[PDB]
Design a protein around this ligand. Structure first.
Ligand SMILES: Nc1ncnc2c1ncn2[C@@H]1O[C@H](COP(=O)(O)O)[C@@H](O)[C@H]1O
Ligand SMILES: NC(=O)c1ccc[n+]([C@@H]2O[C@H](COP(=O)(O)O)[C@@H](O)[C@H]2O)c1
Length: 321
């Protein structure tokens, strides 16, 4: 065993160094000067000379000076199973879902109405306010590790911002959608064609492909965006409602949509659906529908979920744009 202070110092220094290596090489966006970084690395190298067992092929020093940053899409489990959503395509279907909800929990349920973004699902995990893992949906229990790629998304903060009202959770699994804005999708296609590459047929395909890059620097060069729309496993945070949960996401620095509204009953839900039916074209990214969710966490627990989806939510899908 190496002495505890030595090990502590090495770990801390190596992590700080690797982070700047990632920020400089992958993102082309350093956050400390070249001089500052150089002293940092010099120090890590000194520590390793004094204790050569610390020099490993994985060290930011011994091996990885050019880069060692590749995504391999290895399977990684979600903390809580990621489900899909049941759909409704007609007024009748939606009313039937509402009725079922009424029969189980009466008039105690309110409905959060969110815009359904037609992108790529991404699950992020923050441990003690720090981003540790990001993965794809996969089969729901297990997805693919695209942590490095997710680290290049501007909207995804590496660290959560501490706030008076909302303390940083011990563990936070937050779900969101990754997408391109329409103008950015066109721009990307033009750039791809300029290099002799095939363009993407649609923004969803384009987001998926941009996200899933073995080399995260490719992802860093593209304007991916992310909007959080849900919660998985959480520790140190017990929001009464989804809407209140979104306020904490905001305080912490996570990206959330400004188009969400809280309806009190089905008439309110119906109004939002009719409204976005008329105005979804004005949003700068693709919206295929409206997701209706029982807002009260306790009611969500009661209603539960099936193996494939929540009973407490439903996606009202429009006709193709
Ligand atoms: N606001 C949203 N809330 C929940 N899920 C959303 C939202 N927007 C997009 N989605 C995605 O919609 C997926 C289910 O969609 P679908 O299979 O088309 O019915 C989710 O699993 C999410 O990844
Ligand atoms: N400002 C930075 O964060 C940063 C990080 C990594 C490398 N670099 C620059 O690139 C070279 C350093 O060696 P590495 O190639 O591991 O990073 C030096 O020119 C260094 O200043 C800068």
């Amino acid at each position: 065993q190496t002495a505890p202070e030595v090990l502590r110092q090495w770990q801390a220094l190596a992590e700080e160094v690797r982070e700047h290596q990632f920020r400089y090489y992958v993102r082309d966006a350093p956050i400390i000067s070249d001089a500052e970084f150089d002293e940092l690395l010099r120090r890590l190298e000194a520590l390793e000379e004094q204790h050569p067992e610390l020099r490993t092929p994985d060290s930011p020093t011994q091996l990885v000076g050019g880069a060692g940053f590749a995504t391999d899409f290895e399977p990684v489990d979600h903390l809580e199973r990621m489900l899909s959503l049941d759909n409704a395509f007609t007024a009748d279907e939606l009313a039937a879902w509402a009725g079922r909800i009424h029969a189980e929990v009466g008039d105690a349920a309110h409905y959060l109405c969110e815009l359904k973004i037609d992108g790529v699902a991404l699950s992020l995990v923050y441990r003690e306010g720090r981003l540790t893992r990001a993965s794809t949906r996969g089969d729901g229990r297990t997805g693919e590790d695209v942590t490095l790629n997710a680290r290049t998304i501007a909207d995804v903060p590496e660290r959560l911002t501490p706030g008076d009202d909302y303390p940083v959770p011990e563990v936070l699994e937050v779900r969101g959608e990754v997408f391109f804005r329409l103008d950015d999708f066109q721009a990307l296609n033009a750039s791809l064609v300029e290099e002799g590459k095939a363009p993407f047929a649609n923004p969803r395909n384009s987001a998926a492909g941009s996200l899933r890059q073995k080399d995260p620097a490719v992802t860093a060069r593209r304007r991916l965006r992310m909007i959080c729309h849900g919660l998985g496993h959480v520790e140190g945070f017990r929001p009464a409602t989804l809407h209140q949960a979104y306020l904490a996401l905001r305080a912490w620095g996570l990206p959330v949509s400004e188009h969400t509204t809280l309806a009190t009953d089905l008439a309110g839900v119906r109004e939002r659906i009719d409204y976005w039916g008329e105005h979804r074209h004005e949003v700068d990214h693709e919206i295929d529908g409206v997701v209706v969710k029982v807002d009260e966490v306790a009611l969500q627990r009661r209603l539960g979920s099936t193996s494939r989806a929540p009973r407490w939510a439903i996606a009202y899908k429009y006709p193709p744009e």
